[PDB]
Design a binder for this molecule. Sequence first.
Ligand SMILES: N[C@@H](CCC(=O)N[C@@H](CS)C(=O)NCC(=O)O)C(=O)O
Length: 226
Amino acid sequence: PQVELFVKAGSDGAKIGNCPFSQRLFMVLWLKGVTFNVTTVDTKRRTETVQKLCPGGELPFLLYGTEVHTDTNKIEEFLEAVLCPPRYPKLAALNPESNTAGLDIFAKFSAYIKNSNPALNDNLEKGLLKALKVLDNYLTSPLPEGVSQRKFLDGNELTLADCNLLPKLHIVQVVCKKYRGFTIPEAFRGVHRYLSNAYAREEFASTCPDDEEIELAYEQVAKALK
Ligand SMILES: N[C@@H](CCC(=O)N[C@@H](CS)C(=O)NCC(=O)O)C(=O)O
């Protein structure tokens, strides 16, 4: 049954664009091992065919046979349910906490990077560091369930939880380094090992837009502190 994912185009109207939701779904589809195709969409200059399959302009979106699916959460739920054992592996996490750990980081990053006043930067940076620390503690602490030194959020295999979080953390890293010279403290070993382990996996590394695309995507979002 034909699978086609539709994602946002980057700076040249063609490359895969910066977008954590698209990357999340790309990762899920790759980890499932299903045959699928991808199509990029220049939100301004969309094609006639795309203007019809998805009139509301939602992105990403997924075609399953001739059926269009929208909303990243709903698409992911659908894929986990229909691409299932024995043909395709179950990707859901075992430990519920894995599905929330570190997701507050992205919001904290956003607030931090859009602010330009140095008086407020002190507080936003500390809140970002605190959220990184909370994730670091999750990664270094043993998990309740699972047959810490594990590679990923929930054990040693990538799960749906990593597909959501990794694309966001990657953006946090790339954007923070470029626009603020900020790096995730080396003191946070759980976070750095997670990112190193994730980078070593094609499913994550290969689905990241290039750094230039990510930076350019933030050009009118990210501010230098005055
Ligand atoms: N509600 C959608 C949100 C998707 C979304 O945020 N898409 C982004 C990036 S792919 C977007 O449309 N960005 C447009 C822009 O800011 O220019 C979902 O969660 O699936």
